[PDB]
């Protein structure tokens, strides 16, 4: 009746798919940005040398 | 679980399919890959 989601177990699977996707997307997002930090740092050290 | 193994199989299949194509790097830097060079199976998301 309120916006608290639906107990009907037919979209519980839809939640399960979403949980796997959003989580995996966030995991990739941070993995990418830390690689960028490692690279730009290395390039800055190289120019200093 | 189901989705993780699904993704692993899909990424393997994609890696193989894209390793198949002959288009060289410099050829694609300046010219867009035409649609014919891929089978209509890879498109329409039947994998």
Curated annotation (Swiss-Prot), chain A:
Cellular localization per UniProt: Nucleus
Signal peptide stretch: none
Name of the protein in its database record: THO complex subunit MFT1
Role, per record: Component the THO subcomplex of the TREX complex, which operates in coupling transcription elongation to mRNA export. The THO complex is recruited to transcribed genes and moves along the gene with the elongating polymerase during transcription. THO is important for stabilizing nascent RNA in the RNA polymerase II elongation complex by preventing formation of DNA:RNA hybrids behind the elongating polymerase.
Residues shown, of full length: 50 to 98 of 392
Gene name of this polypeptide: MFT1
Further remarks about this protein from its record: Present with 5910 molecules/cell in log phase SD medium.
Quaternary organization: Component of the THO complex, which is composed of HPR1, MFT1, THO2 and THP2. Together with SUB2, TEX1 and YRA1, THO forms the transcription/export (TREX) complex. THO associates with DNA and RNA in vitro.
Organism name: Saccharomyces cerevisiae (strain ATCC 204508 / S288c)
Swiss-Prot record, chain B:
Locations listed in the record: Nucleus
Note from the entry: HPR1 is not required for sporulation, and is not essential for DNA repair. It is probably not a DNA topoisomerase.
Protein function: Component the THO subcomplex of the TREX complex, which operates in coupling transcription elongation to mRNA export. The THO complex is recruited to transcribed genes and moves along the gene with the elongating polymerase during transcription. THO is important for stabilizing nascent RNA in the RNA polymerase II elongation complex by preventing formation of DNA:RNA hybrids behind the elongating polymerase.
SUBUNIT field: Component of the THO complex, which is composed of HPR1, MFT1, THO2 and THP2. Together with SUB2, TEX1 and YRA1, THO forms the transcription/export (TREX) complex. THO associates with DNA and RNA in vitro.
Protein name per UniProt: THO complex subunit HPR1
Organism: Saccharomyces cerevisiae (strain ATCC 204508 / S288c) (Baker's yeast)
Gene that this polypeptide is encoded by: HPR1
